[PDB]
Amino acid sequence: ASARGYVNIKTFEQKLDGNKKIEGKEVSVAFPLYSDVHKISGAHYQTFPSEKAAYSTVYEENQRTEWIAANEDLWKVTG
Amino acid sequence: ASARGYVNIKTFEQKLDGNKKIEGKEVSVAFPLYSDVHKISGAHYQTFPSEKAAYSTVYEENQRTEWIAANEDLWKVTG
Amino acid sequence: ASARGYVNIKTFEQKLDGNKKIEGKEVSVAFPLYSDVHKISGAHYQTFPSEKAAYSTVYEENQRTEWIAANEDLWKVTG
Amino acid sequence: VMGFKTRYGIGINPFAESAAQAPASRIQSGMPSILNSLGKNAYFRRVYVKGI
Amino acid sequence: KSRQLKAAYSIELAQDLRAVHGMDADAELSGILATEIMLEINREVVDWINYSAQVGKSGMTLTPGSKAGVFDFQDPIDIRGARWAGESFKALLFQIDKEAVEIARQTGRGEGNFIIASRNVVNVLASVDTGISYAAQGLATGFSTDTTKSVFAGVLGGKYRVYIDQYAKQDYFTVGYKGPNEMDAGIYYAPYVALTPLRGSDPKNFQPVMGFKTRYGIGINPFAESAAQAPASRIQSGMPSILNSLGKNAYFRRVYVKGI
Amino acid sequence: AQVGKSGMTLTPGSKAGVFDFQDPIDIRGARWAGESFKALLFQIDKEAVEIARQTGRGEGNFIIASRNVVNVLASVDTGISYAAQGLATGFSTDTTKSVFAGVL
Amino acid sequence: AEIKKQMEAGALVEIAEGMATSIAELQEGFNGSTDNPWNEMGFRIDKQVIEA
Amino acid sequence: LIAFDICGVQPMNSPTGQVFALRAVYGKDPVAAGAKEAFHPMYGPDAMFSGQ
């Protein structure tokens, strides 16, 4: 564990266009990682702190860019 | 072309009722035609100007009633 | 990587008796691990800080008791 | 539309656990939790009663 | 055409920020928004000046053996056989002066009277004796070479108002003409609405919001192209584009420089 | 310190970080101490200018330099003038009285 | 009764706690958040009648 | 010696001091990869930010 706690992020499904949607995603980001970089805003979401990742997908501090990409990916629109 | 530019109109697909939706559509309307008649207000939409129609479906100035039917159609809810 | 730096610890070989010695040892301990627990005093040693572990044997923060055992081992006497 | 808000926090007295000579990690939360206060605070003892 | 920016900040930040750093958070943000808008606007004007500029050191301003558009200090033709900086820097001054004349030839209004240029060009001007003398060079004097204290650097030879483009992309100078009238500049910036603050809060969660909005409009002088005998379509847009200002504005000529 | 005479302050024919008095690019084609010493002054100002560009606070205010550089500066007319060199004048060149050696 | 027994045994116990400050700052969709409304309250004013 | 005429001092009366720094950041999220600074001396404003 990061031992610094995590920022737990959940998005909720939203419709974007005909046959275009953003599914909800559940991620947990090491606090210092989240703090260094995040782009979550405007996303139809909720967040909370925890001592251990609340979600199955966890980004540890040393993953840096996997997280940054994963966060921007919260906006990916698919069929 | 209208040679006065176009109003590019995007209606974002939305859910209305149980198994009822208003299909998203992207159309271009000759600037003076749009000005003459339009029903896009409260519609879940976005517009912009251009020198040439941005979309494959275009309502040229010499249409009047085809565009009117097309406006009513942006409020039409289907399966 | 602890990303908190390391405490680099070196034990110098000691002569204890006929055919009895404490072998020298070179280890790196995640800074917060060292800060939590260590047992080095009177041991015939040197220490220094670093950004990255100076030695091939490293006790990452998620060890706790492996490092505690490792401190006791710094006093081990062999042939 | 109207409403009210506060911000406060409730803490723990250092040494309240009275069960360690070396609190883990040396910098630790002073807030109550499952792990550090539940059933552990030396300043308070609870007894249930029956039969009154 | 419009511009607008928002701050939209939280309450808890303002509360904690005051408690810890002593900053207000509201005042800081409104300051930033208003400031950013004006900085963006000023850049827009400068970018249009260069966009629309003609290629200098070209056509009737070329030495036949030259590189067609760039003044190269390592090229013996461009530097007229000059040596050391004391004789060589003056060669640039000659090309600048030659460009200013060409601006008058095409505008019919006047000679280039200001220069927007890179820091390197200005340091070259500042470090050379610009008057008529055998040669001279030394530490920079006459023109500020900074951008921090001012953008305006000084007046070249008492003739050109020199400004430093603090964001020059490569290394170059643009010689331009500006008359006393606001109808004689080639490029115009014509404000209509500016920095009106808008305030409120979202009445669900009471978090404060704010922002600013403006409206300007820009344009190209009739006859800025100057060469054309007539415009197409009679009633035309004055807003700059590919079909009406790029590489055409007679008021400006951009010369790239190398070898400094 | 960053490498000077680099990027925006690098003449295309130069060596990136070094000013060589025997190199015609660095001394702008000069021949004579009375001309090539002045060429160094030019490069010094270019460096000062970049410091302002990157810091946003002001142009370089001081120079830390070897004895050889100081003697070059000390012996040359630093103002804008035709050409000139002679014995060192207004700058300390010694290091026995002080480190500070006047203002360029 | 079953719940009370578990409470007595310490198996399941009473707790009270506030909101993380970062949750409260985002309520009612601030900054794109969602499904996070403030809890609310009102009143009912009722009556009774007496004949003679 | 060259004294300290070429540097700052900021003497300490305690070990380990700290300094804060403020940046004006645009692009909605102040803390993000790509979070361009508004007043950096080496970069111009995104003229097309508040505009087209």
Is G35 in contact with E209 (CB distance < 8 Å)? no
CA dihedral of residues D12, D15, D21, D27 (deg, nearest 10): 40
The residue of chain A nearest to residue G33, with distances taken between CA atoms, is: A45
The two beta strands, A26-30 and A20-22, are: unpaired
Through-space distance between the first and last CA atoms of chain A, rounded to whole angstroms: 35
- Alpha carbon distance E13, E64 (integer Å): 66
Chains linked to G by 3 or more Cβ pairs within 8 Å: A, D, E
Chain F touched by E83 (CB under 8 Å): yes
Backbone angles phi, psi at F71, to 5 degrees: -65, -35
Handedness of CA E21, E25, E27, E31 (dihedral sign): positive
Is C10 in contact with C30 (CB distance < 8 Å)? no
Size of interface E-H (CB pairs under 8 A): 38
Q: Is E44 helix (H, G, I), strand (E, B) or coil?
A: helix
Residue B13 with chain A: CB contacts under 8 Å: 15, 17-18, 20
Tally of CB atoms within 10 A around B70: 20
Alpha-helical runs (H) found in C1-79:
31-36, 65-72
Q: Kindly list the strands in the beta sheet with A57-59, ordered across the sheet, starting from the edge strand earlier in the chain.
A: A45-50, A6-11, A26-30, A57-59
Chain B touched by A17 (CB under 8 Å): yes
Question: Which domain covers residue C60, as residue numbers?
Answer: 1-79
**DSSP codes of every residue in H3-50:** TTTTS-----SSSS--------B-SS-SSSTT--BTT-TTS---TTSS
Chain E touched by G27 (CB under 8 Å): yes
Residue among E112, E123, E206 nearest E159 (CA): E112
- Alpha carbon distance G13, G1 (integer Å): 14
CATH of residue A57's domain is: 3.90.930.20
Residue H32 with chain A: CB contacts under 8 Å: 37-39
The two beta strands, C14-17 and C20-22, are: antiparallel
B39-66 burial, b if ≥16 CB within 10 A, otherwise e? ebeebeeeeeeeeebbeeebbebebeee
H or E stretch covering G33: none
Per the DSSP assignment, residues forming a β-bridge with D31 are: none
Backbone angles phi, psi at B14, to 5 degrees: -140, 155
Size of interface E-F (CB pairs under 8 A): 102
Beta strands in chain B (DSSP E): 6-11, 14-17, 20-22, 25-30, 45-50, 58-59
C40: left (phi over 0), alpha (psi -120 to 50) or beta: beta
- Resolution (angstroms) stands at 3.4
Chains linked to D by 3 or more Cβ pairs within 8 Å: C, E, G
| Pairwise CB contact (< 8 Å): B24 & A18 | yes
Indicate the length of chain C as a whole number: 79
CA A50 to chain centre: 14
Q: What is the count of structural domains for chain B?
A: 1
Paired tokens of E66 = 């030259």
Per the DSSP assignment, residues forming a β-bridge with H49 are: none
- Alpha carbon distance E80, E69 (integer Å): 16
- Alpha carbon distance E195, E35 (integer Å): 10
Paired tokens of E111 = 């000679």
CA F17 to chain centre: 13
The residue of chain G nearest to residue D46, with distances taken between CA atoms, is: G8
For every residue of chain A, which 3-state class applies, written as one string? CCCCCEEEEEECCEEEECCEEECCCEEEEEHHHHHHCCCCCCCCEEEEEECCCCCCEEECHHHCHHHHHHHHHHHCCEC
Paired tokens of C51 = 């950004």
The residue of chain A nearest to residue G27, with distances taken between CA atoms, is: A46
Chains linked to A by 3 or more Cβ pairs within 8 Å: B, C, G, H
Single-letter code of the amino acid located at B44: H
Distance (Å) of CA E207 to CA E7, E13, E25, G19: 11, 11, 13, 17
| Pairwise CB contact (< 8 Å): D39 & G24 | no
Single-letter code of the amino acid located at H41: P
CA count, 13 A, side-chain hemisphere, G42: 4
* Chain H nearest C-alpha distance from E97 (Å): 30
Residue among E137, E49, E53 nearest E92 (CA): E137
- Which residues contact residue B17 at a Cβ distance below 8 angstroms, ignoring those fewer than 6 apart? B77
